[PDB]
Amino acid sequence: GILKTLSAPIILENSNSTFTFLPGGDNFEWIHESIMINAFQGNTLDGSTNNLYLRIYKDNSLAFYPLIGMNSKSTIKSGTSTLIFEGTAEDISYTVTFRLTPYGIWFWDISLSGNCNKADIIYSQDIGVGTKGSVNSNELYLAQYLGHSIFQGDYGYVICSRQNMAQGDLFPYLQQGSLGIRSIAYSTDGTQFFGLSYKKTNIPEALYGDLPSKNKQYELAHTALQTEAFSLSGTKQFSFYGICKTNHPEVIREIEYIQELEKAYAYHESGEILPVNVPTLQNIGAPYASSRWDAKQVEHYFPKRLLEEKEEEALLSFFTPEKSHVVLQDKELTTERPHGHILMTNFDVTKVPQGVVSSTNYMYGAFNCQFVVGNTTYNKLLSNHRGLLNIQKDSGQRIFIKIGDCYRQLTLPAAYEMNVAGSTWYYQLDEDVLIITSFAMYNRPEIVLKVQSLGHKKYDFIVTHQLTVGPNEYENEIKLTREGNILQLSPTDPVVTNHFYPELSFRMRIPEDCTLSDDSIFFHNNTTINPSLLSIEILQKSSFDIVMQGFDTGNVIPFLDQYDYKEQLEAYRIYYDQLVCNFKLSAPDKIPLSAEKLNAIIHWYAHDALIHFASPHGLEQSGGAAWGTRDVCQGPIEFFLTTGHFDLVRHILITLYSHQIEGGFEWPQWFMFDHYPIHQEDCHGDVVFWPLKAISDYIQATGDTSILNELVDYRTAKDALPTNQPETILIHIKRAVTTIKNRYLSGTALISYAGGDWDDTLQPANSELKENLVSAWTQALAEQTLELLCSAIKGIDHDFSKELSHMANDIRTSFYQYLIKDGVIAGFLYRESEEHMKYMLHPDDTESSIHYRLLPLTRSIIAQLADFKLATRNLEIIDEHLACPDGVRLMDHPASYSGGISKIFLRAEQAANVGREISLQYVHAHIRYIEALATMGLSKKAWDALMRINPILLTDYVPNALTRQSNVYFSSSEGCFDDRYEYAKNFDKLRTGDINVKGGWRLYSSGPGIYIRRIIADLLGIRFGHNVIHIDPVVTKELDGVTLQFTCFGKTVFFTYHVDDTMDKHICVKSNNNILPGDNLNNIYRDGGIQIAKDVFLSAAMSDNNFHIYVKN
Ligand SMILES: OC[C@H]1O[C@@H](O[C@@H]2[C@@H](O)[C@H](O)[C@@H](CO)O[C@H]2O)[C@H](O)[C@@H](O)[C@@H]1O
Ligand SMILES: [Ca+2]
C-alpha cells in the first residue's frame, strides 16, 4: 500500500512567483524566487494561520468572521494568477480577490456590500521570509532575525521587514500595507495577535479589541493591520498588499517601491476565473479545551503535592513524591512558551547508543510529535511540533472526541502530568474525566498512547497522525501495509532514510474495531486531500490504545499483550536513580528549600542531559540529530564523568576522535554519530580544544591512558566518509595541536579567533577579524586545555608532554602580556602588528558602549590561570558590571544593532529579537560562573547563583522573573524588551530588576549536564579520580547537618556535612569516628579538599557507610 503525498491543488503563478493554496484557499507555500514568504504551511483540517477578518460592532455585541480559507465557508474561483473568494457574513456580502502580480507583489482586494452601522477589517499574515529549508528547519529562529520597521504611508501603517540572517547570500524583505483604507493599528508578533488565551479559547485574542500598535520582536513573525472603522450602505472596496524583495542589503529607512506598487496595483489577469470545488468539514466542531479544576478536584486527583507554585492563590504547578511534575491549565495560559516534554527509551549506559526511540509532546493536546528511532531528523514517523500557540494543531498524533453532534479536537487539559517515563493529560468533560497517557516502554523501542474514560463512559474518537516516514511531511510517498490490527510503515526509495537505514520500519498496533482512512472522513464529500494524514476512527469505546514501534535496523519484535504504564514508571525510576548515583539530600529537621529543589530537579536535568546526548533535540530546537562537537564534550561528558559512567565516556571519545577531519585535522562544528555521513566541516576557533580537554579529563578521572593507543579513523571534509587510514588517538591529538600552533599571531602565542569562540553569535563579520582578533576566553581555554593535556600525556610520551608544557607557558605568557590592561582582562584584542593593537570589550574601548566580557573572567578562574589578585578583580568586575537578579550577564551592554547589518559580530548584530545569547544571560555561561565560584570556595555566591537559574519556584527567588515550565532547563533569561533599541536604551533595568525577564529555549543544552556537575562535583564536592575520591565541598552553613546519599565506586554511602568555620584545618572526613587519611588537593585560591584512596574509602564504607565531612567555608 502506497500513501500518496499532499500537493497543494491551487497553484498561482506569475513571473518568478509561485503561490500555492489548499482547496479552501488556505495558504500552503508562498514562494517568490527562492524565498518563502509565509511562516507556516496550511493543513487540511485547520487551514492556515493567515486570514482577513470582518468585524461588526453593535450595541450589545462584537462579531468577527474570517473571509478567506477553509473556515470562511467562502466559495472559490481560480485563474492562473487570481483567486476569488465569495460569501456572506451576517447580512454583509463580500468578495475577496487575491491577485498575484508579475512584480513580486500581491493584493487582497476586499469588496463589501450591505448595510451596517460599524465594521472593520483585520489583516493577518504569518511571515517567514527565508528559504524554504530555513523556514521548515525552525520558524522561531528565523523570526528572531526578521527586523520590522514601521511607517505611516498614505493609508496609515505599513510594515517593512528585513531578514538579517543571510538566506543563501541574500537578505530578503517584505512590505505590507493597505490601499484605499487607513490602517490605524498594527502588530508584528503572533503572541500579540492570537495571545496566550488562544491555547484555550481557539479564538485570536486581538479580535475582541484594538491591535496594540507595537512592534514586538519575538518568534512568531506575524503581521496584522486593523482598518479604520466604517459604515456600509451599498458597496465599499479597498485592498491590502504585500511586496517581496529577495535582496535588500541596506537597512530599512523609509517606505520603498511606491511607483512599483502603484504599477502592480493596476495588474489584472486576462484569463477566465472559474469555480473550483471546496471540500467542507462535516460534523467537526471547534476544538475542546477542558474546564479548569477547582481546589477540591486538584486535591482529589493529587492529594500529595510538593513545591506548590501559586499566583493569586491559584495553584499553577507542583511536584509529586512519585517524581512527577504537574501543571494546571492556568499556568499554560500564562507561559509564552508551551509546556512540553520529550520521552526517550532506555539504553545500555556503558555504550554510545543507537536506535534510541524518542517522542515529543505538549500540554495543549499534542500527544506525540517527532516519533523517531535513532536519527531525530531522518528516522521519523510523525511530524514535528512547530510554533508556540497551537494555531496549526495538526502535527504528530492528535485526538478528536465526539461531543454532541460534532467531533472536537482535544486541546488544553485541566492538568498535565509529566514523568521521565510519560505524560498524562486530564480533560474534564461533562460528568467524566478523560485520561490520556503517552509513555515509553522500558527495554523496548516503543511509545504507547492510552486513552481512558474514568467513569467508563463510551465515546467516539478520531486519532489523526501526520506521517512523515522520513524527515518531513509532504515530501515523499509512504509504504503502508496492514495485517489485522498491525500497521507497518516504511519509506519509499527516494527517501534519504531508505539509503542509509534500508531496513527501517515503524509499526502501529491499532484497536481491533477501528476504521482507517486519511483526511477524507473529515469532509462532507469524502475527498482525500492529505493522503498521509493517517486517521483512526474508534467508535463507542471507553478506552483504547495505540502502540508505536520503531526499528531502525529492522529487528521487529511482537507486541506485548498488555501495555502497563506503572511498570515502565517503576523501571525508569530505578534507571534514572542509577544514572545519578542515587543522589538524595536529606536532613532530620526540615530540609533546606535549596536541597528540596535539587532533589526535585536533578532527575529532570538528568533526563534533559541524556536526551541532549542520546537523542539530540529540544523543544524549540527540534532540528538536531547530530552531536555538536563542543556540545558533546560538555553536557554529556561532564555529566557522565560526574556520575562515574567512564566506559560510556571512553566510547564517546573514540567516536568523537573518529570524526576528526582529515587534512585540516580539526573537528567539524557538528556531526552525525550514526550511519548518516553528514557534518559541518567549518568550525568555530574554539572547537579543536574541546575534544582535547575532554580526553584529558577522562584520563585524569580514570587513569585509562590506553585510550591514547586506540586506532581510530578520520572523516573526509566534503563527504563526511571514513578515510580508512586510522592512527592512534595520540597522533590525532598531535595533529590537532599542530593546528593550534598555526593559529599564533606572528611574533606571539596569541591564538587567532578564527571561526569564533563559544558564543555562536559572535562570529567575525570579515576575514581581517578572523585573522587578527584574539578572544581572551579562547586564549584561556587553550592554556587550560594544553596543561590538562600535558598531565594526561606525561606518562606516555615525555617529549610531547614537554612540548605541551612549553606551548601552554607561551600561551599563558601571551595572555598576561597582551590581554590584560589596568587589571581588566579584555574580551578581545585586535592586532594587525605590534604597532597596531586595540582592545574590544575592555574599558579602553571608549568609543564602544561595551566595556566588559564575562567569559574570560570565569574561564581564567576555572583554569587556575588567573593569579589570586587578578581572580579577585574578575569577581569585582562581575559584581559591579555583569551581575543581575536573574544571573550574570555575558557583557555589560548589548551588541550593536543598527537595522540588522553586521560590522564586527555576525548574528549578535543581526538578531532583531532580544533572546538566546543576545539576551546576555545565557544560562550555560552562568553555570560556568558557578564553576569559577566553586573553584574560589565562594559558597554563598555559588549556592545563590545555583538557585537563580533553578526553575523550581523561580519567581519567588528572582522577583522580576516570569514563571516558566518548572521541570525543564531554560537556556536563557531575557528582558521583556520589544526591540534591540529599547534593550540598549534601558539595559540597566536588567541590573536593578526593574524590567521583567522570561525564559528562553528549553531542554536542549549542555546546561543540564554541567549544572549536574556543578551540584555534585563542585559544590557538594564529590569527585572521582584514578583510584581516588576527591572530597572538596563548597557549601554554606545551611547545608550543615544535611546528608547526601551517593553511590561511589558501586557502593552507596551517606555524606553528612558539618560546616565549622572554627576548625584549625580546612577539611576532615570521618567514618565511625575514624579520620580518613589522604592528601590535600592543589588550589591557588583557597585551601583544597582531600584526596582519599579508593581502597581506603571503600574499606571504611564496608564497616560504616555514613561519612562525616567537616569543612570550613
Ligand atoms: O538552532 C539554533 C541554535 O543553534 C546553536 O548551534 C547548534 C547546536 O546547538 C547543535 O548542537 C548543532 C547540532 O545540531 O547545530 C548547531 O547549529 C547555536 O549555538 C545557537 O546560537 C542557535 O540559536
Ligand atoms: Ca542544619
Residue numbers in the entry: 1 to 1113
Sentences from the paper on this structure:
In this study, we identified the function of LpSOGP, determined its crystal structure, which is the first one among phosphorylases acting on β-linked glucan, and clarified the binding modes of substrates. In addition, LpSOGP did not show phosphorolytic activity toward cellobiose or laminaribiose. These results indicate that LpSOGP is highly specific to SopNs, as LiSOGP is, and is completely different from other GH94 enzymes in substrate specificity. The tertiary structure consists of four domains: two N-terminal β-sandwich domains (residues 1–257, yellow, Ndom1; and 295–553, light blue, Ndom2), a catalytic (α/α)6 barrel domain (593–1020, green), and a β sheet domain (magenta). Ndom1 is unique to LpSOGP, being missing in CBP, ChBP, and CBAP.
In order to understand the substrate recognition mechanism, the crystal structures of LpSOGP in complexes with G1P, Sop2 (with isofagomine d-tartrate (IFG) and (NH4)2SO4), and Sop3 (with (NH4)2SO4) were determined at 2.1, 2.0 and 2.2 Å resolution, respectively. The Sop3 (with (NH4)2SO4)-soaked structure shows clear electron density for the Sop2 moiety at subsites +1 and +2. The Glc moiety at subsite +2 is a β-anomer unlike in the case of Sop2 soaking, though two ligands at subsites +1 and +2 are well superimposed, suggesting that Sop3 is bound at subsites +1 to +3. However, since weak electron density was observed beyond the 1-OH group of the glucose moiety at subsite +2, Sop3 appears to be mostly disordered at subsite +3. The disorder at subsite +3 is perhaps due to fewer hydrogen bond interactions than at subsites +1 and +2. These observations are consistent with the similar kinetic parameters for Sop2–5. The glycerol molecule is well superimposed with a part of IFG at subsite −1.
